[PDB]
Design a protein around this nucleic acid. Sequence first.
RNA 1: AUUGGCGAGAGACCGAUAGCGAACAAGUACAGUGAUGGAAAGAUGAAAAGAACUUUGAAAAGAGAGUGAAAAAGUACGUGA
RNA 2: UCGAAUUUGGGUAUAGGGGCGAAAGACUAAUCGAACCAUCUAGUAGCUGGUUCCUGCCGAAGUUUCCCUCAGGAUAGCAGA
RNA 3: GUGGAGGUCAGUGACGAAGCCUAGACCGUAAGGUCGGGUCGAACGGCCUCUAGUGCAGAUCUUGGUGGUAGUAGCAAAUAUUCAAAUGAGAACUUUGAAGACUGAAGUGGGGAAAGGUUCCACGUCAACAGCAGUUGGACGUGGGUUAGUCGAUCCUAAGAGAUGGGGAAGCUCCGUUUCAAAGGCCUGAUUUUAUGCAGGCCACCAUCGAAAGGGAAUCCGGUUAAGAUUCCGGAACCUGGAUAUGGAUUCUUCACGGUAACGUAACUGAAUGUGGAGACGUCGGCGCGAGCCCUGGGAGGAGUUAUCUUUUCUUCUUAACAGCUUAUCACCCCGGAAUUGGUUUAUCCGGAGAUGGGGUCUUAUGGCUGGAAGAGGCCAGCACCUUUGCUGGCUCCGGUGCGCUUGUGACGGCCCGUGAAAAUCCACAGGAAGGAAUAGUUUUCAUGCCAGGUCGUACUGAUAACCGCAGCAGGUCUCCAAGGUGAACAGCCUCUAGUUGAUAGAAUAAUGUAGAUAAGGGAAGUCGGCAAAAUAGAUCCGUAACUUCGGGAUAAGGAUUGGCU
RNA 4: ACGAUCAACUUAGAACUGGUACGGACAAGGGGAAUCUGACUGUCUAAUUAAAACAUAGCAUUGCGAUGGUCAGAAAGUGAUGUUGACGCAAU
RNA 5: UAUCUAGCGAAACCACAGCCAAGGGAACGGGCUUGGCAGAAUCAGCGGGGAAAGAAGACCCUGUUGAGCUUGACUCUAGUU
RNA 6: AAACUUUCAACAACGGAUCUCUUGGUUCUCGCAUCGAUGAAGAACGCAGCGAAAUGCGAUACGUAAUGUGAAUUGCAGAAUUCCGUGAAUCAUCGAAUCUUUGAACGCACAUUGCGCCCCUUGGUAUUCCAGGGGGCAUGCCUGUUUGAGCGUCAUUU
Lengths: 251, 57, 60, 50, 81
Amino acid sequence: GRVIRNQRKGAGSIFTSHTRLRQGAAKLRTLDYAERHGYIRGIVKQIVHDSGRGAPLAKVVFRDPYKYRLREEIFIANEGVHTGQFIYAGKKASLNVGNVLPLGSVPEGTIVSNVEEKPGDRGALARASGNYVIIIGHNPDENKTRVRLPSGAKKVISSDARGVIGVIAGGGRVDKPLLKAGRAFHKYRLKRNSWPKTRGVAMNPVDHPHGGGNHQHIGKASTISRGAVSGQKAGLIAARRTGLLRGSQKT
Amino acid sequence: RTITAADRRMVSGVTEKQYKKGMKKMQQLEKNAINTQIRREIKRVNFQTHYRDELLQ
Amino acid sequence: VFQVSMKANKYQIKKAVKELYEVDVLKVNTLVRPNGTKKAYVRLTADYDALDIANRIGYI
Amino acid sequence: AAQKSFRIKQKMAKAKKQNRPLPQWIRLRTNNTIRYNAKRRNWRRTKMNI
Amino acid sequence: GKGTPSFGKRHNKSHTLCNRCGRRSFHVQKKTCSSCGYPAAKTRSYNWGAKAKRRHTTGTGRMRYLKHVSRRFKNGFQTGS
RNA sequence: AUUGGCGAGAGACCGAUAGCGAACAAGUACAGUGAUGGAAAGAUGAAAAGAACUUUGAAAAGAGAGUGAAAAAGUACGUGA
RNA sequence: UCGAAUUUGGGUAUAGGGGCGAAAGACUAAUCGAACCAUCUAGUAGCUGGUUCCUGCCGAAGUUUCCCUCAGGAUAGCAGA
RNA sequence: GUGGAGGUCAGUGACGAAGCCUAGACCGUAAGGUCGGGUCGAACGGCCUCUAGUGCAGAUCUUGGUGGUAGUAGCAAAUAUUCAAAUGAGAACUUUGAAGACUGAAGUGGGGAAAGGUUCCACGUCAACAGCAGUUGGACGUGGGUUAGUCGAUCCUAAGAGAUGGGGAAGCUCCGUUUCAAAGGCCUGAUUUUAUGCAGGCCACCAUCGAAAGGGAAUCCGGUUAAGAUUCCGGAACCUGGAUAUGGAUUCUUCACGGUAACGUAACUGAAUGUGGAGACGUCGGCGCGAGCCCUGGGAGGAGUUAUCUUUUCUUCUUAACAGCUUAUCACCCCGGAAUUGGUUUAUCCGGAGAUGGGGUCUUAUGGCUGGAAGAGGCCAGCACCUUUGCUGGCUCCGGUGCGCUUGUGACGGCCCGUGAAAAUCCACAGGAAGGAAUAGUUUUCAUGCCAGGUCGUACUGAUAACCGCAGCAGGUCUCCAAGGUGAACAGCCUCUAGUUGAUAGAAUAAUGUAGAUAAGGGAAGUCGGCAAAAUAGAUCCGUAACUUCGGGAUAAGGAUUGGCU
RNA sequence: ACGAUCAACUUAGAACUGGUACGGACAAGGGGAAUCUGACUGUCUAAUUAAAACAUAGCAUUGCGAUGGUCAGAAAGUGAUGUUGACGCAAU
RNA sequence: UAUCUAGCGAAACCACAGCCAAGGGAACGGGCUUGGCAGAAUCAGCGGGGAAAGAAGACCCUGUUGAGCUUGACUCUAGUU
RNA sequence: AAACUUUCAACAACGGAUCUCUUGGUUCUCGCAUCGAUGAAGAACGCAGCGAAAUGCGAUACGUAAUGUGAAUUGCAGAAUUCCGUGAAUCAUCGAAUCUUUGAACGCACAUUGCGCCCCUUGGUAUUCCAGGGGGCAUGCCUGUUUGAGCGUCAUUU
C-alpha cells in the first residue's frame, strides 16, 4: 500500500498554511507589571481584515512603560470596538466592551473572549469569529474560575488569566451558503490547501483504506479505534456513536 | 592584413600547394570516419527502449 | 587600441598609458574580446595626436 | 544567451580558440601520427553541453 | 503528447558548472555538485562506482606536486646544491 | 598481509574482434539534466627517393615520364581471404 | 471553454515504498500496479535455445519403488568399459 | 588438425619462409597430408614427448562486412512561378533588372527572455552537408567584430535556502534561524602616554544567500560601421560619492519673512530618541482627460495619371532628454448661513459635522509657450561633375474632427467567508542635545564653481534552418509595437510599410486514392447508429408553447424585409 | 418670441430602378416531442476510454479545550495544522 | 499523387525458392507420389495465397518463479497502551 | 541466336580476414615507504616564432635557477663561435625559485570574476573620499601572554 493522504499531510511541503498576507500573530499584551497590577490605556488605531481569519483584527497601540517607544499589539476584534476607542487592559480596568480583564475581576455571567488559557500566554480560547466564553463561577480561595467554552465544555482556569470582554465579532459568517465551488476555493486559497477533498472510497485500494472494490463501498466498519496506528485512522475515529442524533442532545 | 595566414604558414613550411593537398587529405579522412561511424551506428541506433507501438505486439 | 591583460581595469589602463607613453588620456573604454582578452580604447586629450603616438610606438 | 556569465564566456572563448583544423606543419614531422583534428567541435553538430 | 512536444518545452538548466570539478553537474536548486559533492568537504566517492573513482583518483591530473616527491624521497630530501 | 604508490626481474600468458576499456591526442570522442554510460582506431618503404617534366581536361584526375628491388607498396598505402 | 475552480513564464517546496494526485493507479525527464544509475550479480531455474574433427566396436530406455512426486530426481532394470 | 613447451632432424628459407588464389596432380575409407602454377616478402616444418583459452552452420549467438529486394518505395501540406543580362567549365535554383504573387500589422514585419555559442560580417572557396542542383549558404579556409557613471547584474527582500550558539546521531551529517549565547557597530570628537582606548555617548539590534519579469539614484537626439551603440562621435542633461571657493541668504530681536487661512519663497542651525509618508500593490465596468496612431482642409515641394475626366491619386512639412514660466480633476481655506430643500454624475451622492454662491490655496500626472533647436533631420532646386561625392540655395507653415485603435491616467462604481507582498532606501515631522553674536560668528536642504564614477554582460538568431525534439523535423517554446477597406470585430477576404517568392523539377491527365465540389426523381428505403454531408445562419421587425427553483426555457417554435440611386 | 456659424454618423420614411436581385464572395444557430443519467461551471487516464467517472456547493457523522486531536522524524531543547482555538482544525 | 523522364535514392522481409488437382503426411504442400502441364525478358494494377510481415501469445495451463493489492492465512514489526 | 540468369577461371573491384611483426596488457616474484593548512589530490583558464590535441608549464608559463654530459634542436623559419667552452640540447640530474583563478580552502560570498575590513605606502588641494602597490583578517583545539567577568570565594581596608 501507499502513504495515504492524511498521513502525508504532516510532512509539511505543500500543506503548510499560506501566511503571506496575514497581519501577524494576533495576541494580547505580555503580562507585564502594569497589566498585572493595574491597567494601561491603548488606542485602537485601525481595524483590518486578516486573510484566512473570519474576524477582523484591531491594532491597539500602547505606550511602552519603560521607554519612549509605542508598541503596536494586534488584538482579535470584539463586536463594538471601533477605531479611536480607548482600550483599558489589566486588572484595575473597568468593565467595558473591548477591555482586557483578568477573570478574577469580572463578575459571574460576564461574556468574554480571546481568553488567556494559562496566565502568561497570549490568548488561547474563544477566538474564532463570533465566539465567546461565559464566566460560570469563581473560587477566590483557589484563584480559579469556572468558564463555559464555545464547545459547551466547562473549564477551570486561573483567575489571573486574562480575557477580552465581548464577542469576537465577524459573527454569523457560516450562515451564508457558499454557492460556487469558487467560493470555497477562494476560502481555502488562504488556508493550508485543504480543498478539494477527494472521497476515500473513490480512491484505489492502494491509496486509502476505503479504496477499491467493484462498488464504491467501505466494506469494513468505518469506526476506527483510538488505538489504531497512524495510516489506519480514516473515517470515524474513536466514535462513541454514529448515525443521526434524533434527540435533543441539549441546546 | 599586412601579413596573412598564407604568409605565416609559408614561413612555417607549408606552401599553398601543399596546404591545399593536406587540407584535401584531412577532409577526405574525416569523411571516411563519418562513413564508418554511420555504417556502425545504423545497426543499433534504432533500438528504442520504450517504443509504444500503437498496435501493441 | 590596446590588448590589455584581463586582470586590469580602467584605472590601471589609464595609469599605464600615462606611464609608458607620456600622454594624457581623456577616457578609457574596455571590453572582453570574444577570444578571451581585454581590449581597451584609450582616447587621449586634444593636445596629443594618436597618429603621431602610434607611429612612435612603432606600428603604422 | 545575451546576458552571459563571465565564466560561460570564458568557456566560449576556449571553444573558439580550439575551433580550427590541424596546423599543417605538424603533418611533416617525423613519426607523425595525427591525421586530422579529431576534437573539432562545431555548433551545428555537437553542443558544448555547458 | 509526452514525447516530441514535451522535449520542446525544456530550456532551463537543472545543473550548471561546479567550481571544484569542471563537470556541468552542480545542481542549481540544491546547490550541490552531484558528481563531486561540493560544497561538502569530502569529495563524493563511492565503492560501487569503481569507474567513478578511476576517472578522478590520483593520476588523472597534472599532479603539480606529487610527481616530484619520488625524486625528493630517492635523494633523501636533501637541501642546498 | 598488500589487485594502492615508487623501482626492478621474469612467464610452457594474450598477440590488435585477443590482452586492461584504452598497444594510438582513452577514461579521449560521444550520449544523458544528473548519477553515470563510453567506444572505434596499430603496420607504405631501408630511405619519401611522397611521382620533376609532357600531354587531355574547367578541375578532381587520366595518359605518358620518373623514384623504387617492388607502385602486383601511391599517404584510400605489408599481405589482401 | 473562452473573465473564471482561467492560461502561462521565472523563483521555490515535495524524491521512490517516497512525492503528488478535483482519484485514471494517474504523473514523477518517450520509463510507473513502485523512476533512473551503479554494485551485491556471471543472482537462481525441475524451463527454452546452442553445444565445434574423422573412423572403428558395443549399443539402449520411456518400466518397478519412493519423493508437495506428475516437464524433475533417487532407486533398481536395460548399456558400455 | 590448431596455439604454445622440452628434445631431435648439425631440418626448410630473401636463389623467396608463412599466408592467400588455383572446375591442375598424387596419397588416405575419413578427419586430412603432399606437389605443381600464380601472388607474395621473413619467418617456418617433420618426428618422440609435454601442454591447452585446440576444431563451428546454426544458439531471434557477438563484432565487423555485403547482398536480393531496388534504380524500386519514394523525394506530393504551407496558392507560383516566368523573361532577359551578368558570373561561371557548367544556371530552374547564384546576382541584378523586369513582371506575376503571397505573409496582410493575434505578419513570413521590427526587438527581446530561456537557450544556442561566433551561427554575426568580409575575402577566398566546393572535397563533404544543403535527402535535385549549385558559382549560393547558418557549409569549408582565413580574419574582423560586441566600447556604458545613466541599460542590466551588482544592492533589497518574497515563498524559501542555510551557517554560528546550542541540541541529536556510531557516522557521513540532521534539527533549528534568534533561538536556555558573555554574540557587536555607529557617531564622533578624541587622548596626543594607545590603542583605537576614547569626552564618551548611543544602540540592542541578530550571519548570510534568494528575482537579468518584483523594489531600484542618474540620458536623450542627430550622425557614424562590412559587422557596434540609450555604450562610439558631436551636441545637450542628470545622479551619486567627495573636496570645496565665491555670491546670495540669516542674526545685537542670534538661528528669515509674508498670507485671516488653505499656504508661498532661492535660501532660511538642529544630536540622541520616537512618529509618519513614500517604497506599497486586487480585479472588472462605464465616464473625463492626455499621448501616439487613424481620418481630413488650406498652403509650400516631388512623383504618378492624362483617348477622356480628375482644384486629382501617392508622397515630405518632425522636434528628444532635460530646464524656466504656466497648466488639474480631486482636495482644502476665507466670507456667508440653506425648506419654495438645493447642487450634481453616464452611474445617486452631498450639505448646520456648514450646501449652492463670491473669492482664494495646493499636487503638476498632463498639455501650452520658450530654451535644447534648426545649427539637426526631411523635402526639393541649381552648379560642380573619380571626389568622404562636394558647393550654394530655398521651404520645413496654419488648422479640423471623433462611442475611432493602442496606451497612460484621474475621479468613481461593482465583487469577495478572496479585501488582493516584503525589505533595502529616501524624506518629513515631534524633541531641543550641541553650537553661533556684532565683522562676532553659526551654518550652506540656494546659485555657481572643482574631481571621480570600478567589475562583468553588450555581435547575431529567438525559429517551417541559429533553442529542444538523434536532423536544415508540418511538433513544441514566454513577451512587446500593430496602417487602410468591408464589417460589430486585433473574425474572414484585399491592399500600404517591411519581408519573402523557400519546400527537387520537366511531360502527360489511366485505374485506385487524398483533398474540394455538383448531381435529375425519391428522401434514411443505407446503416449498429443520420456516421459523413446538407439544410438554417448576419441584422431590423412580428410572433413565441410545455414546464419552471419564477431567475429561465428563448435566438424557442414560426414568419417578413435586406442592393443601388435621388 | 427669437438670429448667425461649425461638425458627427444614427434611426425611420418615400420615390425611381433592376432577368424579384440585394447578410449577392467571406462570414454565419438546424429545430421539435421525450426517456436513462449526472444538478450546474470545473477536472483526470500526456500517447486507444472526457464519461453516467472525480470535484463541487449543500447535508450529516466523528475526534479534539493545547498536559489536546490528526500527522511527521532514526533522534533532538525536532516539526505540519499553528501568524491556529470549536462560526477552528482534523477524519470521513 | 499514382504514371514516364533527369537527379537523388532507402526499409520490412529473405532456409532454398516460387503453376495447379488429388493422395498420403504432424490429420490444409511450393517441393514428396500420380496426373494436368510447361517457352526467354517483362510493365501498371491487384489484394486469393505465400497457415505473408510486425512481438519468444497478453487468453489458458505448468513452474514447489514473482509482483501489485486484500484479509479473520503463518510469522514479525514502527507507533501506541 | 542474342539478352538475361546460374557455375567456374583470369584480371579488376567491395571488405580487411589470414600470415608475419608489437614501445601494450595480464599474471608471478623481489626491493622501498614518500601526500596535504610550508596549502595536497582534483578543476578551470591561459603559455610556444609558427599548436588544435597529447605531454610540459604558470604572467619568470613546452618553462627560470643549480649540477652533470659535451655540440645540437629539427617540419620550416631563426640563431649561429653558440661550440679547444662557465657551453647547444624538447638532453639527463634537480637540492634554489616562480607557481594565475580555485580546490580540505581559510575575510563574507559565488550560477557574481560580487562585497567588505585592517596596517604600511604612493597619487589625486586629503586620517575621513577615490585610486594604484605591498601585507593580512576562517573554525575547533592545546600550551602560554594580556585584558577581564562572577557576593563562587579568601584576606585587608573605611
